[PDB]
Amino acid sequence: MKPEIKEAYMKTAELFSQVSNCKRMKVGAIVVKNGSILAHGWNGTPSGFHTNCCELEDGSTNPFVLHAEQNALVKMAKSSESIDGSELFCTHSPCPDCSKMIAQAGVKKVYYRNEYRITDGIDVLQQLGVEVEKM
Amino acid sequence: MKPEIKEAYMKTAELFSQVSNCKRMKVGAIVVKNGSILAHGWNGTPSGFHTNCCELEDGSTNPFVLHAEQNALVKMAKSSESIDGSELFCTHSPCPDCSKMIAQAGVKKVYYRNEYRITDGIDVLQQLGVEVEKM
Amino acid sequence: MKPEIKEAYMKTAELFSQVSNCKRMKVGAIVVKNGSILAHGWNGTPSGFHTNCCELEDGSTNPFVLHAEQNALVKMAKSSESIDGSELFCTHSPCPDCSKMIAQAGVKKVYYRNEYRITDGIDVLQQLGVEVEKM
Amino acid sequence: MKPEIKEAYMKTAELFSQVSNCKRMKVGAIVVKNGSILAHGWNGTPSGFHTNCCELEDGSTNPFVLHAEQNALVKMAKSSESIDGSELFCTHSPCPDCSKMIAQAGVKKVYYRNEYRITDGIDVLQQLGVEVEKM
Amino acid sequence: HMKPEIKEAYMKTAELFSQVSNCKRMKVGAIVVKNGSILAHGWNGTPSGFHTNCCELEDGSTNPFVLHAEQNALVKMAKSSESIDGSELFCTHSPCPDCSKMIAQAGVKKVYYRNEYRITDGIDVLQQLGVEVEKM
Amino acid sequence: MKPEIKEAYMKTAELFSQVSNCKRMKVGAIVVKNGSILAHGWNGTPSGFHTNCCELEDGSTNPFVLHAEQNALVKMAKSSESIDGSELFCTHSPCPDCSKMIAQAGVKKVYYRNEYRITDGIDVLQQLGVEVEKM
Ligand SMILES: Cc1cn([C@H]2C[C@H](O)[C@@H](COP(=O)(O)OP(=O)(O)OP(=O)(O)O)O2)c(=O)[nH]c1=O
Ligand SMILES: Cc1cn([C@H]2C[C@H](O)[C@@H](COP(=O)(O)OP(=O)(O)OP(=O)(O)O)O2)c(=O)[nH]c1=O
Ligand SMILES: Cc1cn([C@H]2C[C@H](O)[C@@H](COP(=O)(O)OP(=O)(O)OP(=O)(O)O)O2)c(=O)[nH]c1=O
Ligand SMILES: Cc1cn([C@H]2C[C@H](O)[C@@H](COP(=O)(O)OP(=O)(O)OP(=O)(O)O)O2)c(=O)[nH]c1=O
Ligand SMILES: Cc1cn([C@H]2C[C@H](O)[C@@H](COP(=O)(O)OP(=O)(O)OP(=O)(O)O)O2)c(=O)[nH]c1=O
Ligand SMILES: Cc1cn([C@H]2C[C@H](O)[C@@H](COP(=O)(O)OP(=O)(O)OP(=O)(O)O)O2)c(=O)[nH]c1=O
Ligand SMILES: Cc1cn([C@H]2C[C@H](O)[C@@H](COP(=O)(O)O)O2)c(=O)[nH]c1=O
Ligand SMILES: Cc1cn([C@H]2C[C@H](O)[C@@H](COP(=O)(O)O)O2)c(=O)[nH]c1=O
Ligand SMILES: Cc1cn([C@H]2C[C@H](O)[C@@H](COP(=O)(O)O)O2)c(=O)[nH]c1=O
Ligand SMILES: Cc1cn([C@H]2C[C@H](O)[C@@H](COP(=O)(O)O)O2)c(=O)[nH]c1=O
Ligand SMILES: Cc1cn([C@H]2C[C@H](O)[C@@H](COP(=O)(O)O)O2)c(=O)[nH]c1=O
Ligand SMILES: Cc1cn([C@H]2C[C@H](O)[C@@H](COP(=O)(O)O)O2)c(=O)[nH]c1=O
Ligand SMILES: [Cl-]
Ligand SMILES: [Cl-]
Ligand SMILES: [Cl-]
Ligand SMILES: [Mg+2]
Ligand SMILES: [Mg+2]
Ligand SMILES: [Mg+2]
Ligand SMILES: [Mg+2]
Ligand SMILES: [Mg+2]
Ligand SMILES: [Mg+2]
Ligand SMILES: [Zn+2]
Ligand SMILES: [Zn+2]
Ligand SMILES: [Zn+2]
Ligand SMILES: [Zn+2]
Ligand SMILES: [Zn+2]
Ligand SMILES: [Zn+2]
Numbered sequence: 131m132k133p134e135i136k137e138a139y140m141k142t143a144e145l146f147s148q149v150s151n152c153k154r155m156k157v158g159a160i161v162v163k164n165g166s167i168l169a170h171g172w173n174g175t176p177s178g179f180h181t182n183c184c185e186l187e188d189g190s191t192n193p194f195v196l197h198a199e200q201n202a203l204v205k206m207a208k209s210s211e212s213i214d215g216s217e218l219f220c221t222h223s224p225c226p227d228c229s230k231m232i233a234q235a236g237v238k239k240v241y242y243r244n245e246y247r248i249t250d251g252i253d254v255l256q257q258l259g260v261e262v263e264k265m
Numbered sequence: 266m267k268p269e270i271k272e273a274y275m276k277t278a279e280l281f282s283q284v285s286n287c288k289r290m291k292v293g294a295i296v297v298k299n300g301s302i303l304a305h306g307w308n309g310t311p312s313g314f315h316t317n318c319c320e321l322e323d324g325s326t327n328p329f330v331l332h333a334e335q336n337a338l339v340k341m342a343k344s345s346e347s348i349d350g351s352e353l354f355c356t357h358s359p360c361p362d363c364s365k366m367i368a369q370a371g372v373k374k375v376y377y378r379n380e381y382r383i384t385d386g387i388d389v390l391q392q393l394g395v396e397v398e399k400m
Numbered sequence: 401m402k403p404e405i406k407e408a409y410m411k412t413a414e415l416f417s418q419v420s421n422c423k424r425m426k427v428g429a430i431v432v433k434n435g436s437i438l439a440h441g442w443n444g445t446p447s448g449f450h451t452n453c454c455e456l457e458d459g460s461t462n463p464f465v466l467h468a469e470q471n472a473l474v475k476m477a478k479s480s481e482s483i484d485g486s487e488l489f490c491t492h493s494p495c496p497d498c499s500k501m502i503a504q505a506g507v508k509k510v511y512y513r514n515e516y517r518i519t520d521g522i523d524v525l526q527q528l529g530v531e532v533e534k535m
Numbered sequence: 536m537k538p539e540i541k542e543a544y545m546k547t548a549e550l551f552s553q554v555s556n557c558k559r560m561k562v563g564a565i566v567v568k569n570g571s572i573l574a575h576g577w578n579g580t581p582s583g584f585h586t587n588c589c590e591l592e593d594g595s596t597n598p599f600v601l602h603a604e605q606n607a608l609v610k611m612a613k614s615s616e617s618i619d620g621s622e623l624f625c626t627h628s629p630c631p632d633c634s635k636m637i638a639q640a641g642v643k644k645v646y647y648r649n650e651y652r653i654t655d656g657i658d659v660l661q662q663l664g665v666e667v668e669k670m
Numbered sequence: 671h672m673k674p675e676i677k678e679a680y681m682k683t684a685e686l687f688s689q690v691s692n693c694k695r696m697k698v699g700a701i702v703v704k705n706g707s708i709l710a711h712g713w714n715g716t717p718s719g720f721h722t723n724c725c726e727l728e729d730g731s732t733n734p735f736v737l738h739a740e741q742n743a744l745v746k747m748a749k750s751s752e753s754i755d756g757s758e759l760f761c762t763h764s765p766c767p768d769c770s771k772m773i774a775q776a777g778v779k780k781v782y783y784r785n786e787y788r789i790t791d792g793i794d795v796l797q798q799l800g801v802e803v804e805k806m
Numbered sequence: 807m808k809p810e811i812k813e814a815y816m817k818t819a820e821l822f823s824q825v826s827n828c829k830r831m832k833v834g835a836i837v838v839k840n841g842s843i844l845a846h847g848w849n850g851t852p853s854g855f856h857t858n859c860c861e862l863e864d865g866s867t868n869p870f871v872l873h874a875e876q877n878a879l880v881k882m883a884k885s886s887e888s889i890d891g892s893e894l895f896c897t898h899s900p901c902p903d904c905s906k907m908i909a910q911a912g913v914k915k916v917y918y919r920n921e922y923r924i925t926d927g928i929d930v931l932q933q934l935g936v937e938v939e940k941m
Contacts, residue, residue: 138686145679145686166750167683167708176369176393196369204369207341207348209707211752214343227362234311234331234339258311273415280411284404300475302412302437344434346481446639446663464659466635474639476612478619480886483612496598497632504581504601504609524599528581543821550817554810571881572843610842615886717910717934737906745910747883749890754883768903771872775852775880795870799852 136219139167140243140265143219146170147198152184154191155222159198161206163216168209171201199228203235213237224251233258241265266352274302275378275400278354281305282333287319289326290357294333296341298351303344306337334363338370352376358399359386368393376400409437410513410535413489416440417468422454424461427468429494431476433486438479441471469498473505483507494521503528511535544572544624545646545670551575552603552626557589559596560627562603566611566642568621573614576606604633608640618642629656638663646670680708681784681806684760687711688739693725695732696763698739702747704757709750712743740769744776754778766792774799782806807893815843815895816917816941822846823874823897828860830867832897833874837882839892844885847877875904879911889913898922902930909934917941 139162147158150172161169175182175195184195196204198220206213214236223242224232229251232240239261242252252262274297282293285307296304310317310330319330331339333355341348349371353359358377359367364386367375374396380387390397409432417428420442431439445452445465454465466474469490476483484506488494493512494502499521502510509531512522525532544567552563555577566574579589580600589600601609604625611618619641627649629637634656637645644666650657660667680703688699691713702710716723716736725736737745740761747754755777759765764783765773770792773781780802783793796803815838823834826848837845850860851870860871872880875896882889890912894900899918900908905927908916915937921928931938 134690138690141686142683145682149675149679164750165746166710169707176365178394194365196365200366201369203339203342204366205706207338207370209705210345210347211707212343212345230311230329230331231335231339234336235342236312259313269419273419276415277412280408280415284402284408299479301439301479301481304436305408340435344436446635448664463631464635464663466639470636471639473612474608474636477608477614477640478617479612480615480617482615500581500599500601501605501609504606505612527599529583539825543825546821547818550814550821554814571885572846575843614842717906719935734902735906737910741907742910744880744883745907748879748885748911749888751886751888753886767869771852771870772876772880775872775877776883799870800854 136241136265139219140221140241142167142170143221144243147172147221150174150184150198151182152191152195154185154189157198158221159202159224160219161202161213161216162219163211163213166211168211168213168216169202169205171196171198171203171205173198173201197225197228198222199224199232203228203231206235217241222246223249224255226250226254229254229258229260233260239263271376271400274354275356275376277302277305278356278376279378281307282356285309285319285333286317287326287330289320289324292333293356294337294359295354296337296348296351297354298346298348303346303348303351304337304340306333306335306340308333308336332360332363333357334359334367338363338366341370348372357381358384359390361385361389364389364395365393368395374398406511406535409489410491410511412437412440413491414513417442417491420444420454420468421452422461422465424455424459425492427490427492429468429472429488429490431472431483431486432489433481433483438481438483438486439472439475441473441475442468443471467495467498468492469494469502473498473501476505487511492516493519494525496520496524499524499528499530503530509533540570541646541670545648547572547575548624548626549648551577555579555589555603556587557596557600559590559594563626564603564607564629565624566607566618566621567624568616568618573616573618573621574607574610576601576608576610577603578606602630602633603627604629604637608633608636611640622646627651628654629660631656631659634659634663634665638665644668677782677806680760681782683708684711684762685784688713688762691715691725691739692723693732693736695726695730699762700739700743700765701760702743702754702757703760704752704754709752709754709757710743710746712739712741712746714739714742738766738769739763740765740773744769744772747776758782763787764790764792765796767795770795770799770801774801780804811841812917812941816897816919818843818846819895819897820919822848826850826860826874827858828867828871830861830865834897835874835878835900836895837878837889837892838895839887839889844887844889844892845878845881847872847874847879847881849874849877873901873904874898875900875908879904879907882911893917899925900927900931902926905930905936906934909936915939 143158150156157173220242278293278295292308354376413428417426420426487509493516548563552561555561625647628651684699684701691697698714700712758780761783763785819834819836823832826832896918
């Protein structure tokens with residue numbers, strides 16, 4: 131948990147966030163455990179969806195899209211390693227709904243760089259016993 | 266998947282719905298794969314939460330409670346082995362939100378007994394490719 | 401870890417015993433660990449056998465049939481999951497030979513509902529340091 | 536397959552049959568899959584049993600002892616790999632009971648050196664679609 | 671067959687973890703990717719607990735005890751409880767012949783590398799042993 | 807660890823050294839952990855390599871040939887179990903190169919029978935933590 135190591139991880143989240151394909155906001159989220167990146171998620175439409183555009187015609191977000199934290203945890207369910215006891219490097223502070231599942235997933239600590247508009251997500255993670263660090 | 270085994274799976278879903286401490290609705294969700302129940306999830310408040318009562322007064326559901334699908338999905342993240350290519354036995358038809366993550370998790374089919382008030386998740390499921398059976 | 405969840409597992413064991421085609425006695429046994437039902441076995445003929453019938457033409461039990469415990473054990477052998485540390489829910493008390501293999505399997509505890517005429521299997525379990533509870 | 540690799544596995548069985556303490560008969564059984572020894576078992580008392588001697592005070596076999604094939608299967612259960620689609624190398628042809636479970640496990644083929652007194656184990660193995668080879 | 675923006679994202683991840691190498695003659699990184707997950711990030715350096723994390727001797731040449739990024743990547747996979755078989759590799763620098771041997775036997779499908787090393791002969795071993803190679 | 811079983815592990819390494827197609831020397835390596843053989847490797851050309859002959863016409867060794875230790879190491883990377891905390895049984899003492907990787911892998915101890923021409927490999931193991939016993 132060396133400051134040089136943690137920076138490389140947060141920079142990895144930022145770098146996978148640049149795949150997002152969304153134009154509103156590009157969000158990334160990786161799962162880190164035992165020196166391994168078990169899942170990297172970013173915001174976008176479901177797999178095999180008829181479009182990878184995240185926006186509607188009024189430029190608002192397609193309700194079908196999944197958050198970064200959503201995709202990361204869903205991917206973990208698809209993987210064969212556990213998410214429990216792992217850490218989470220987000221480019222943005224997570225959504226309150228996502229924070230609910232992140233805590234229930236037994237994630238010990240969530241790292242976020244940028245603060246989203248709304249900040250109740252951080253507040254949910256803390257109530258549910260998950261340590262938070264801004265970097 | 267003989268139909269006497271399919272029933273046993275579905276009744277197992279109902280058994281674990283009965284241990285839920287929500288009184289608006291008791292919902293259970295089962296993950297089945299290779300002759301194994303990898304996760305049994307029921308609706309309720311997060312782990313270590315101060316109260317295990319899922320209601321507010323108003324008869325309203327506490328915004329912090331997790332769906333039976335959310336829990337089953339999260340436990341699949343929590344543990345090893347994969348939710349991918351598995352089948353889901355629910356007591357009630359799942360909501361739009363969970364049906365998004367279910368499809369992204371590569372769940373082949375969703376088995377549900379009761380149809381909820383609104384049935385958009387059912388039509389969200391087969392629109393994202395997940396097969397759907399009512400029993 | 402909870403009495404109602406405990407009662408759910410045992411009632412799941414009874415659900416699967418009813419799937420058995422056997423006429424003499426329908427036995428079920430499931431493998432539980434970390435909230436996951438890793439194996440659920442019931443008595444019957446081996447896979448692909450010419451009959452799913454468990455009895456010969458004189459009413460006695462076919463020597464090719466497997467116990468519920470044998471199947472619960474064998475599926476763990478077919479699994480990519482470990483039976484070591486698991487607990488066992490059976491509708492009946494396992495036979496001396498199954499018990500012999502159950503202890504060697506590293507099963508912490510055996511739950512059982514119906515006491516079987518001849519109870520040496522229980523005795524074998526206690527002897528080999530396996531916790532046993534009737535319910 | 537290659538001939539000299541085949542002999543290596545079989546004499547490994549004879550090698551581990553020799554670490555058994557039983558005097559009546561020393562049996563060894565190795566499970567092989569994808570060119571890997573996933574389990575090696577021999578006959579003896581359960582783990583942590585008070586004595587490692589397998590004989591009664593009259594030369595008979597303690598009904599508590601495990602067959603080499605039994606330990607090989609139980610070990611596979613504790614293992615985190617599948618015995619399904621594997622090959623088994625025994626020093627002696629297995630008994631009917633183990634033969635039942637061997638077939639149910641999904642064992643492709645059984646290699647054996649010595650042919651036991653009673654040969655109805657090979658019978659059982661063959662009827663259940665398990666190929667057999669003496670070497 | 672990998673989407674170009676993701677393929678780029680992994681290769682840059684290898685470059686990020688190569689910056690932790692502590693070696694000063696050349697910083698090497700190696701990523702193990704299977705099923706969209708990064709199972710191992712390895713970089714060149716001394717072994718665990720070694721008296722120095724300094725990779726070089728008094729003359730500017732590499733300490734023989736220094737492990738390659740590819741060695742660390744595969745050793746990690748060995749200690750790791752997942753398989754390296756059927757996975758692909760992201761290297762900042764093309765692997766050496768000795769490592770390429772182990773890489774091939776490890777059942778690695780493909781090797782992406784960004785920097786061509788002075789000596790090609792590592793890539794030769796990869797290609798001849800049926801492991802795909804792509805420079806980017 | 808028991809003497810009867812420690813020798814069985816060593817002889818197992820020798821059985822697998824005998825399947826090497828190298829006429830220059832025949833080496834074998836066994837990984838043992840929690841009383842189980844996890845990997846077995848010997849010296850030879852890579853898999854699917856056009857020839858299985860380890861030597862050139864000059865008589866010297868083909869540089870494509872892996873040591874018995876690289877094979878045991880790689881097979882462990884291919885494996886789904888962990889090499890860290892295990893013991894390594896070798897027919898001959900490993901080279902310094904393989905010794906570095908052995909040490910980094912967290913191998914507790916290395917049993918060996920024959921010392922190689924060069925004995926530098928042992929010294930490297932000693933220095934890097936790995937315990938060494940000649941047997
Ligand atoms: C591959 C991958 C996808 N995702 C997310 C991003 C998207 O929301 C969703 C998949 O997006 P889409 O990648 O674009 O996947 P696809 O199968 O539809 O491929 P294409 O659109 O090019 O035909 O899953 C991750 O979070 N992590 C990953 O590693
Ligand atoms: C054990 C278990 C929990 N859950 C869910 C239900 C709840 O929403 C959530 C937490 O349940 P809580 O069971 O009540 O567990 P707890 O750790 O909070 O213990 P207690 O509340 O008594 O102090 O976990 C499942 O969905 N399936 C399961 O098998
Ligand atoms: C599926 C399943 C089978 N078994 C056991 C019970 C039986 O003894 C054995 C084989 O059962 P049979 O289910 O009836 O399987 P089958 O393929 O032979 O049936 P069919 O020919 O009609 O397709 O497997 C379990 O113990 N648990 C399980 O979940
Ligand atoms: C370790 C091991 C044991 N067994 C079996 C053989 C025995 O019947 C049983 C127990 O082996 P023994 O281990 O040697 O008995 P133990 O566990 O009580 O140890 P000790 O007697 O020295 O106190 O497990 C195998 O079949 N394969 C193995 O690799
Ligand atoms: C942690 C880690 C180490 N390594 C390698 C790099 C090094 O060569 C080797 C050990 O590195 P050292 O990180 O420096 O670890 P250490 O236990 O010696 O701690 P310190 O030196 O600070 O006292 O393992 C990787 O390849 N990937 C990783 O994630
Ligand atoms: C199966 C196996 C192979 N190996 C190594 C030894 C060799 O160096 C390498 C390749 O062996 P090759 O046995 O000869 O196997 P192959 O896939 O090349 O088949 P073929 O007969 O056509 O050549 O694998 C081990 O170290 N341990 C093992 O258990
Ligand atoms: C808040 C939040 C937003 N996002 C993405 C989803 C949308 O495509 C993008 C634009 O934000 P908005 O649509 O919520 O205004 O934000 C995440 O991926 N994770 C989050 O936690
Ligand atoms: C719609 C839906 C509700 N539930 C739970 C949420 C609450 O625990 C309970 C009451 O829901 P309601 O408040 O939306 O009526 O139903 C599920 O578990 N799955 C579902 O799909
Ligand atoms: C003793 C025992 C019997 N059985 C089954 C075997 C047959 O299906 C049925 C008949 O047994 P019986 O012939 O010994 O009475 O009981 C089990 O499934 N598990 C057991 O432990
Ligand atoms: C038949 C058989 C016996 N054995 C063991 C049981 C005792 O350890 C020893 C003597 O068997 P017996 O006393 O049944 O003749 O042989 C096996 O390990 N595998 C077998 O298949
Ligand atoms: C060739 C090669 C070198 N390296 C490291 C060894 C030293 O750390 C550094 C200098 O290489 P050199 O000393 O072999 O020229 O590069 C790798 O990590 N992987 C490789 O494939
Ligand atoms: C030194 C060493 C050689 N070998 C093999 C390499 C060749 O197969 C054979 C000849 O070694 P050499 O050619 O390096 O003297 O011995 C090992 O398997 N392990 C070792 O540690
Ligand atoms: Cl998982
Ligand atoms: Cl298993
Ligand atoms: Cl591994
Ligand atoms: Mg897409
Ligand atoms: Mg609670
Ligand atoms: Mg049948
Ligand atoms: Mg003992
Ligand atoms: Mg260091
Ligand atoms: Mg070959
Ligand atoms: Zn969110
Ligand atoms: Zn829902
Ligand atoms: Zn029985
Ligand atoms: Zn037997
Ligand atoms: Zn190298
Ligand atoms: Zn070597």
